[PDB]
Ligand binder design. Structure first.
Ligand SMILES: [Mg+2]
Ligand SMILES: [Mg+2]
Ligand SMILES: [Mg+2]
Ligand SMILES: [Mg+2]
Ligand SMILES: [Mg+2]
Ligand SMILES: [Mg+2]
Ligand SMILES: [Mg+2]
Ligand SMILES: [Mg+2]
Ligand SMILES: [Mg+2]
Ligand SMILES: [Mg+2]
Lengths: 185, 141, 126, 57
RNA sequence: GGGUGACGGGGAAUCAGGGUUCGAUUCCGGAGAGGGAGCCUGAGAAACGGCUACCACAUCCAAGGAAGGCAGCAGGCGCGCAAAUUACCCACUCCCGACCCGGGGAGGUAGUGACGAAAAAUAACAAUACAGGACUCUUUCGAGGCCCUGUAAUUGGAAUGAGUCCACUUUAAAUCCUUUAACGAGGAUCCAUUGGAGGGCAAGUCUGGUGCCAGCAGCCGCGGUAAUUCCAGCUCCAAUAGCGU
């Protein structure tokens, strides 16, 4: 006996036919569009998506008016609206299965840091997020993947203690000012 | 035809239970024999001792010699002709030297040009051949 | 000056003889303000000295402009050395502990199993 | 029959060479960027009977 | 009756639907404490960190005698393909006691830890030289630049953690994270691997050596003096803090 959870899963699935080629093309195109790091990052989304698509299938096999579908479905949609993937009005379950990877990348932090000016190219965006430069709401988000709720989006910007967003300038500029003061001047 | 009826389960089940023992693989798992017959007593690898270096003449169309090692295992005390992979690698191995040996991709079946060689050598004196062949590590002395 | 300390989930424990609450320390630009400094703030807030105040468990957030931790403020030192953990008194050393260091005790007690009655030798032992 | 002699015959006598000094290759994401760029955005030319990424006449 | 590489179950891995396989292992039940037997105590034991026997192993003996049980935690030998520290503490969870107070290798805490799982760096931006193409202009050549992509010069400073490290916080006491001062990047650097590049199967009919040898190759095959298959160099491809077997 101990404490200790052990509860943990993977986040993705690796594709069976492992050099489909067309698959590779589309997957890299995705890595290019949304500045992803790796083949996994696409795959882990592709695994989230599926799960949603599975559930939505399972709910459609049930009868309508049956409390299970009405309840879950609503929630599952309310969840998907909150992340800014599915649209209010488009909330009615069958419309989920018609959905894709691209939409679930669109509401990354990095993608919304690039989109919401701030950055200057999707790569730049991704670096900043990591470097402890941007904050959502109030916390400094460090993690590119941070899926940003539709609620949250308008509150994304730089951190209050970090060069770009009005802060003490970083150690590189700080050194060169010391060089100009003592060395040159 | 099939038995098909409703209260057949048993007849159906027992029939398939029987017919599983005409499936070559199933039989391998569920008769003893195979487990008994391997020198690696159902183990992925086994250590052994190289009791001579042995010239294995390759299977017809691909004419060559293969360079193998007559191992004798620790666990069983059975013997083997383990293949030594890669070029010039045989020379790393010396007589009476502690090889870890593995299977050869084929789970009992022999492989490629070698005839009747189930096993390849992996490590010599706790070093690993790949390492020696690369030149990362050196043979201890 | 620039620290700030807010409170939360505050309880008046008549029966543990203590005011106990969550402290939530906004403190941007500095380095998790020390526990001494928290207790002197709490005193001015609660008008009730530092000696009866015991503070612990401060965790600082990612990013860094907030810490969070439990504290309580006893009704008196009479009480604060009664319904209070010993280690936490020893944090501001008023109820320190002995330095026998376990193992030495266990090996003494494992002897004396050997001997019967000898009050002086049983006292001796090691 | 047949000797265990020649063994490392070839590997031995081959003409050994150094492995040059080029560059630190970009890694992780940046590598992936660069890869993406050279399939899709840089070239995208007028076709001339299929392609080759390591081809050399 | 025999076998079981059989402790049972909750469950686990796979999966369209059906299945297949696994479940010594953190909860529940059971069993056993080197093996077999007997029993005292006690509400509860046929207890083994209780006895009494035999057997098996072992230890001192002044040779008459006497003592033993890690399938507790550490640790060792041995066995192997195969597995962590003779660490700290009762602070948490709980338990036992006559007990608010003592005790607990149960239990926690570190240490070891590429079993596995989650996040996630290894660069980002600029104007240059240029190299290209939707637009505008031009018969073509050339040009105006909202648009942009590659290679360079590191040209340019900006940003940063890895790291070093005062101080808090943490905590039983610590460590770790976390917060945080101060130092802390021109890639000669703070250097990303592992596998492959004839087909299946992404990717060289390139360049050297070998000459059915050495060797590769899961399979089909390659190798007998122009080897896309070997050994090397160059490039390329896949996955990437991972990848082979
Ligand atoms: Mg058995
Ligand atoms: Mg028992
Ligand atoms: Mg034993
Ligand atoms: Mg007994
Ligand atoms: Mg015991
Ligand atoms: Mg191991
Ligand atoms: Mg324990
Ligand atoms: Mg991991
Ligand atoms: Mg590196
Ligand atoms: Mg292939």
């Amino acid at each position: 006996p101990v404490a200790r959870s052990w509860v943990c899963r993977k986040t993705y699935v690796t594709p069976r036919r492992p050099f489909e080629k067309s698959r590779l093309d589309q997957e890299l195109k995705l890595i290019g569009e949304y500045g992803l790091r790796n083949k996994r990052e696409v795959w882990r989304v592709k695994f989230t998506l599926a799960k949603i698509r599975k559930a939505a299938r399972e709910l459609l096999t049930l009868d309508e008016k049956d409390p299970r579908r009405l309840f879950e479905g609503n929630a599952l949609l309310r969840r998907l609206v909150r992340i800014g993937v599915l649209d209010e009005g488009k909330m009615k379950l069958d419309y989920i299965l018609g959905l894709k990877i691209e939409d679930f990348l669109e509401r990354r932090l990095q993608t919304q840091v690039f989109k919401l000016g701030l950055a200057k190219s999707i790569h730049h965006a991704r670096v900043l997020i990591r470097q402890r430069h941007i904050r959502v709401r109030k916390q400094v988000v460090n993690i590119p993947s941070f899926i940003v709720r539709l609620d949250s989006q308008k509150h994304i910007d730089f951190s209050l203690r970090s060069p770009y967003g009005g802060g003490r300038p970083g150690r590189v500029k700080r050194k060169n000012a010391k060089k100009g003061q003592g060395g040159a001047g | 035809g099939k038995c098909r009826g409703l209260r057949t389960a048993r007849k159906l089940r027992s029939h398939r239970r029987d017919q599983k023992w005409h499936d070559k693989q199933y039989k391998k798992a569920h008769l003893g024999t195979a487990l008994k017959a391997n020198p690696f007593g159902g183990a992925s690898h086994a250590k052994g001792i190289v009791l001579e270096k042995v010239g294995v003449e390759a299977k017809q169309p691909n004419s060559a010699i293969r360079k193998c090692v007559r191992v004798q295992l620790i666990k069983n005390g059975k013997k083997i002709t383990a293949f030594v992979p890669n070029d010039g690698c045989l020379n790393f191995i010396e007589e009476n030297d502690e090889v870890l040996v593995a299977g050869f991709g084929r789970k009992g079946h022999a492989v490629g040009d070698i005839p009747g060689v189930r096993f390849k050598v992996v490590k010599v004196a706790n070093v690993s051949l790949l390492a020696l062949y690369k030149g990362k590590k050196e043979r201890p002395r | 000056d620039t620290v700030t300390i807010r409170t939360r989930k505050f309880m008046t424990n008549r029966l543990l003889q203590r005011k106990q609450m969550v402290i939530d320390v906004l403190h941007p630009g500095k380095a998790t303000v020390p526990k001494t400094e928290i207790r002197e703030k709490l005193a001015k807030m609660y008008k009730t000295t530092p000696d009866v105040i015991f503070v612990f468990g401060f965790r600082t957030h990612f990013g860094g402009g907030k810490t969070t931790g439990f504290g309580m403020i006893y009704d008196s030192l009479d009480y604060a050395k009664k319904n209070e953990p010993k280690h936490r008194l020893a944090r501001h050393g008023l109820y320190e502990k002995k330095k026998t260091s376990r193992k030495q005790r266990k090996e003494r007690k494992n002897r004396m199993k050997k001997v019967r009655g000898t009050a002086k030798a049983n006292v001796g032992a090691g | 029959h047949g000797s265990l002699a020649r063994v490392g015959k070839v590997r031995g006598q081959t003409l050994k060479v150094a492995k040059q000094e080029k560059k630190k290759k970009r890694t992780g994401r940046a590598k992936r960027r660069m890869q993406y760029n050279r399939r899709f955005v840089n070239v995208v030319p007028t076709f001339g009977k299929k392609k080759g990424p390591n081809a050399n006449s």
